[PDB]
Amino acid sequence: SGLTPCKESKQFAKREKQSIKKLESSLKIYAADSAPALAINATIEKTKRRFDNYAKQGLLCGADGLPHLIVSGDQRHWGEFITPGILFLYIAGWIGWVGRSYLIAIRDEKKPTQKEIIIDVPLASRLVFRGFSWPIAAYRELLNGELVAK
Amino acid sequence: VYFDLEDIGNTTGQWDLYGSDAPSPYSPLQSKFFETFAAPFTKRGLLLKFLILGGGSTLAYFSTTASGDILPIVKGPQLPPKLG
Amino acid sequence: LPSLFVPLVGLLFPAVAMASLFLHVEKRL
Amino acid sequence: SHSVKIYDTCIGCTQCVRACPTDVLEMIPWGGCKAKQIASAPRTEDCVGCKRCESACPTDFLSVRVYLWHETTRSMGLAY
Amino acid sequence: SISVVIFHFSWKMQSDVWGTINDQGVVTHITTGNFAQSSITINGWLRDFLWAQASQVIQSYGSSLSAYGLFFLGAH
Amino acid sequence: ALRLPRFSQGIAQDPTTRRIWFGIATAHDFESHDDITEGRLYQNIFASHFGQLAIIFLWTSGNLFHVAWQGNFEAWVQDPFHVRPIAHAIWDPHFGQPAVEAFTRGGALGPVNIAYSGVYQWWYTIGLRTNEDLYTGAIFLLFLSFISLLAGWLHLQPKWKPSVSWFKNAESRLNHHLSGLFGVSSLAWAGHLVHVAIPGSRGEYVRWNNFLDVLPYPQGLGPLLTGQWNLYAQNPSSSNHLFGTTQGAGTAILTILGGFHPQTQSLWLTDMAHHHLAIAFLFLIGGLMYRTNFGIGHSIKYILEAHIPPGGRLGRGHKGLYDTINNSIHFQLGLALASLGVITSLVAQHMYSLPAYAFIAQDFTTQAALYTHHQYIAGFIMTGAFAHGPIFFIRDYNPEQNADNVLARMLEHKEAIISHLSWASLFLGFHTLGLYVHNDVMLAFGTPEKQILIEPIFAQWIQSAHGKTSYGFDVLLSSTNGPALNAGRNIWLPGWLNAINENSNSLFLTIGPGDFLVHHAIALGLHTTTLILVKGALDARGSKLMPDKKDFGYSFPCDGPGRGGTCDISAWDDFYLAVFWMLNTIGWVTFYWHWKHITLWRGNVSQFNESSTYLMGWLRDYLWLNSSQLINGYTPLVCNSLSVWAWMFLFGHLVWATGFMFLISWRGYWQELIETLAWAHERTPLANLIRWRDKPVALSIVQARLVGLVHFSVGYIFTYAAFLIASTSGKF
Amino acid sequence: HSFGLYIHNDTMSALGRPQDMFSDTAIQLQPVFAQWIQNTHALAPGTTAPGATASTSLTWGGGDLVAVGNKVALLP
Amino acid sequence: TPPELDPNTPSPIFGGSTGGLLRKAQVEEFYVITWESPKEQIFEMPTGGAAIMREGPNLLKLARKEQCLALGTRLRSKYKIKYQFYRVFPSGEVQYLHPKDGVYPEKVNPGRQGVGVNFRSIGKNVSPIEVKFTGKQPYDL
Ligand code: CLA
Ligand code: CLA
Ligand code: CLA
């Protein structure tokens, strides 16, 4: 954390300033009441909103003038890494768990490959929401998690 | 065209195609001049040595020279970066 | 000017070496 | 030349003998399978090593194997 | 073959054909007629053609042509 | 025998041109030679070893001779900062007049090459001062090179050849290599330092003529045997000390000041004499652990047999592992190369950060050259270590004799090892590339604030622990109330803290988000290359696709198109694959090193810190930017002294791409092409008077991959070297 | 006889021997057959093809240039 | 049973091809394949393009053998024909190659004796180390 918060970084302010002037420059050729003008003014308003949020959410900045992320585990920045991540692992786990629920449903059947190239959508729709409680995979792990043959 | 075990050579096209077999068209004496003056180089081995030692030293000999490039010559040398 | 060892290494040694290798390689005991 | 071996795992299908482009293998009487025949490599001097034999064996693991060895004119497939 | 053909085109046109002309007759070609003296060398193609002209695509970020900058690296 | 190569009858009976090719690439594979025995195996190697040492001694002898005869050195000693060291003289009749002018530098009389190996700083630091010193040194090595050949010849004679059991006397060799080869050598090196090197840095010249009636120290060996060794650190060189002179010169010969000599920016000579003296002790006492002929010591075998964790979680542990290694020379070479490869990188990473030679840090091209040099050597060595490992599994590994020991269990759960290495590579690859591309898009859309720049605070935390003031953190050695600080207080710490916090040197450089990304690239490179190599080793003896991959050996072309197709299925071939990845890995490492350093020397660490976070930056601000003076070596308008590097630069590109031919196009195409040329020659008048003695054939399947890889590698190395040297030396 | 000439040129230039290169200022390899044709199409209108007023292409024009805006459209 | 012998039998109609014999035939070996044709027919030459079979006995000289079997195999199917091929050498000795044992190799014959067969099949072969330094090889066993 050898950095300075973005709220109080001159370089971070110079970037917002320089960016807006560039978009405003383009604003000149199109005159006022105009489609491009409204499009550029919308980018400018989207630009201000962006920088505003970064400062607002206490993100440090580097001498470069750009925010940098802390992933150490520090509590002030869970938003930077840890919070989104857990969110990921939830979804990743969801997808994988549902995907594995399908293969087991498919495995003891006729031609199993037939449903791997042509999806059983009724079956899939039945199993998709099981991923919602996928971290109760843990309780499968206490018993039938993985194969004993290997 | 043919195929006889008797004559395999001929069977497998071992023909001296463009061979002459004609007598020597070279005038004699001329031949004899060349036969006595080029004779030392015809012994092999010795020719190999004559060409290596001879060709080697002959080459060395042109070690000596002028308008090759043996002259950095009177030209003020640059420094030319941090210097040196 | 000793820098005339260059051709010797540069050419003579290589030629001799090549010729010799060539001969050893094509030899049929 | 190359080295080619056969194993009692052979079932006498005879496919390699049919697969070979240079007539290396042949079938001989045997009593280890229902076909009562087994492959043999009596002419490994004419083999090229293309492994068309191996490519045609249905045993779990090949019952005919080709171990590429010393190269000869015959094995190098040279018409010159 | 085709790659050295289209490079033959691109350099020849910019160097000897295309360019700015004003109302005095003065013609100023894009690469300024360096094809004759520097396309005859592989280092010349590396330097005066590739290195020199690739500056636009590697300096296109932030510009309207940055998609070309992305496809440049993307294709590498 | 009959003809070449007569170490192999079966290959001499080859009527094609393949006999010559393969006769050269198998000349050192002694085990595959005809009528080979274990006796002749160890004897041939032993002899080759002397031959190798002879070449090494001869090689260094050449450098010394040429520096003395064609190099300044003496001129360099007076002005280290402002004199370019000369490699040797250039005599090339192809040289045009300009080239002769442009190249005559360093105050030479003719065209010369400028040395970038750094032997000048080394020999100046070492004590060497004039050319006379260099000549006698060259003579000495020429002598050592002779007695190497002489000893190699001697032990090939029947009455001096050593038995195989002599070579398998492990405990004796270890007791001697640790105690004598490492210890005594290091002990005697510190001797040279306090006698010649240190006094030489203090103006007094101590050679053979006067090293007897001259003391290295006033108290002169009295305090050493007394026990009061502290006297040798009583009066160190001053902070205003000038190297080679008495201005500021002390008397100390053994110190621990830490940090750098202010003038030379290198480690204190009195720090290094002490270093080797202390080293020699742990080594001297260390080489008395194993048993010989005096009834004391350890049985290495018995230790391994005794190291079996109860509850058998490692099975039978290390039992039988002694003979597994002592009988297999490949296992020994593998261990040797792996260990050597690691300390080769250790050398690289330590010599740029902690320079030991006077005035070497100021020479930026030399510093760049040496680092890149060793990191590629280390890289090549590492792949070889993972090559003989496989070879061991195929040629020497005895399954029954390694039953259920740690080595066997590796093969037992090989799928688990390989799959996780695959996961680690996939994880690193997906995100490192992912983050790089994300940042490139942000820069493309002109919004750098949207980048993902992760701060490497773990490593920043380490640097703080070392005492770097940046980042804050208040870690050990960075905190006033730290037991670790007050413990080393005013010993090595004042010198260390001063050096680590100097902004010029490369001692623990400041790192940021750009450093974070490249390191994961590096991590990616390591994991993948290992994944390739160990998958190769653990599958050398077989797989599901080829259960009997043994019986076929280390290197074979394939197993045909059956069972799906089996190209590049041999353990030799994944080596072949891994070299590419190792070249890619070291490439990332040296790109990282060289960019970080040229921006530092330029005083512009800003350019690196802001451009190394997206890949366009690397292409534009590192490669495209620094290629300017290089590619202008020769011009439609002129030629420079950098012309040779410009030529070599293309040469590298040429060799590199030429290798693509052997790697992309395969054999059957060329075989059919050649046989049409075989037809042509026989059917051409005047030409069919001349017949070939060896039948022309296409290069073999494996040979192609070897030839291709060599080109790819040669091009790789020669291209970057042309760029590294030119871009650096052009600017310095 | 195509690429080898380049490598020759690279080596001679790097050795500071521009006069030993294959170039217009040294050892010339003037493509006279294509040049003669080029000239023939120039003298084509009026002479060979009387019905043709101007040349087939401006690359055969010789002393004719066409510009639109400030940019060059085509020239010999 | 004794093999057939030859040879004075005619050869097929062809115009000439570049795939023909070379010096190898003259100094190393060359091969001959022979067959009986019921009709005068057209066939694809392995070395060349197209040739005409001659009704009755036919003789063809090819280099390499594989060429012999490739053509012969084609002769067996396609049209029904019986063929044989020999190895010539340069001295004049000749050697009967295929079939070589009465019957074709696909069909089991009692006369034949096995060569290169390992009764311990499987990949039950020993590790290379076991034979290290023993001229042997694991498969040879
Ligand atoms: C270290 C090795 C080496 C050395 C010492 C040389 C030296 C030379 N080269 Mg060669 N060259 C080499 C490697 C080498 N080259 C390689 C690897 C290539 C392939 C890229 C070439 C391609 C090359 C070309 C295309 C040419 C040269 C030319 C030259 C000459 C240019 C200087 C000059 O003009 O003076 C003097 C010019 C002379 C003509 C003097 C002639 C020298 C006399 C006749 C020597 C007598 C013959 C000799 C004894 C026979 C060899 C015996 C030996 C093998 C045992 C010079 C003798 C140029 C040349 O020779 O001009 C035609 C030239 O055209 N080189
Ligand atoms: C059911 C889906 C599924 C599940 C649960 C897994 C699980 C796993 N994989 Mg596999 N993988 C899959 C599909 C799946 N994979 C597919 C389709 C491919 C072909 C691209 C691969 C290729 C692959 C490789 C090369 C590796 C793994 C590895 C692994 C292991 C480590 C985690 C990982 O890196 O995965 C990463 C995932 C990928 C690289 C591919 C993405 C998989 C997609 C997104 C999921 C499939 C979605 C499916 C269509 C859903 C069907 C819906 C249904 C209801 C109709 C883990 C056991 C690694 C391993 O062996 O661990 C030690 C390993 O190296 N996977
Ligand atoms: C202590 C160092 C050491 C030693 C003693 C060995 C010893 C051996 N190696 Mg190992 N190896 C090593 C390090 C070492 N290696 C390293 C660092 C690597 C990674 C690159 C390898 C990778 C390797 C492979 C893949 C193989 C071996 C093999 C062998 C065995 C046969 C060697 C032979 O006869 O071929 C002779 C070698 C040559 C004749 C060299 C010709 C090819 C080289 C590479 C080209 C030279 C470079 C190029 C020309 C540079 C000039 C360019 C110019 C423009 C400047 C032998 C036991 C072989 C084996 O296992 O036996 C079957 C095997 O295939 N090694």
Ligand code: CLA
């Ligand atoms: C730039 C070229 C390139 C790239 C990208 C790769 C990438 C890879 N190599 Mg290869 N390799 C290369 C050159 C390359 N290699 C060369 C020249 C050689 C010498 C022959 C090798 C030899 C080699 C070997 C022997 C091995 C690899 C392995 C791998 C994988 C390593 C694990 C990893 O990074 O996970 C991450 C994956 C990637 C970085 C590639 C994914 C590409 C994108 C990001 C995927 C997303 C697609 C996106 C949605 C767009 C879709 C397009 C649309 C049309 C569908 C990875 C796929 C190892 C492996 O298989 O890992 C287990 C393996 O053992 N490589």
Ligand code: CLA
């Ligand atoms: C046609 C182009 C050409 C040719 C033929 C040469 C030739 C030469 N150059 Mg020049 N150079 C060139 C272009 C060329 N150069 C260009 C364009 C530049 C940039 C301006 C330079 C810049 C340059 C410099 C700075 C130097 C040279 C030097 C040399 C000489 C090396 C002497 C030597 O070591 O002997 C023999 C060659 C070797 C020992 C290296 C060969 C490496 C092989 C491949 C090793 C592998 C061998 C393998 C085991 C097979 C062995 C078989 C064999 C024994 C038969 C040689 C005369 C050096 C010199 O003057 O000598 C002191 C010198 O320092 N050149």
Ligand SMILES: CC1=C(/C=C/C(C)=C/C=C/C(C)=C/C=C/C=C(C)/C=C/C=C(C)/C=C/C2=C(C)CCCC2(C)C)C(C)(C)CCC1
């Ligand atoms: C004290 C210290 C430390 C330490 C650390 C450590 C502890 C270390 C390490 C390290 C390590 C841990 C290393 C490693 C490594 C490795 C490698 C590099 C490997 C390899 C290998 C190979 C190549 C193998 C091969 C083989 C095979 C495969 C088969 C069998 C045989 C053999 C074995 C040969 C720290 C820094 C913390 C801190 C500071 C100081």
Ligand SMILES: CC1=C(/C=C/C(C)=C/C=C/C(C)=C\C=C\C=C(C)\C=C\C=C(C)\C=C\C2=C(C)CCCC2(C)C)C(C)(C)CCC1
């Ligand atoms: C904390 C933290 C950190 C660190 C961390 C770590 C270091 C850790 C770890 C880790 C680890 C070391 C882990 C491990 C593991 C393991 C295993 C062994 C696994 C497994 C698994 C499985 C079996 C799964 C399965 C599944 C599921 C569950 C879901 C979906 C489907 C599937 C099937 C895929 C950091 C600093 C970065 C950041 C902050 C925070």
Ligand SMILES: CC1=C(C/C=C(\C)CCC[C@H](C)CCC[C@H](C)CCCC(C)C)C(=O)c2ccccc2C1=O
């Ligand atoms: C071009 C090519 C050939 C043909 C290449 C041949 C026949 C190379 C012949 C080498 C010629 C004679 C020149 C070699 C001279 C070199 C400078 C080597 C130096 C000589 C010694 C130092 C070794 C193959 O046979 C082949 C096989 C399999 C995959 C790819 C390829 C492939 O790409």
Ligand SMILES: [Ca+2]
């Ligand atoms: Ca520092």
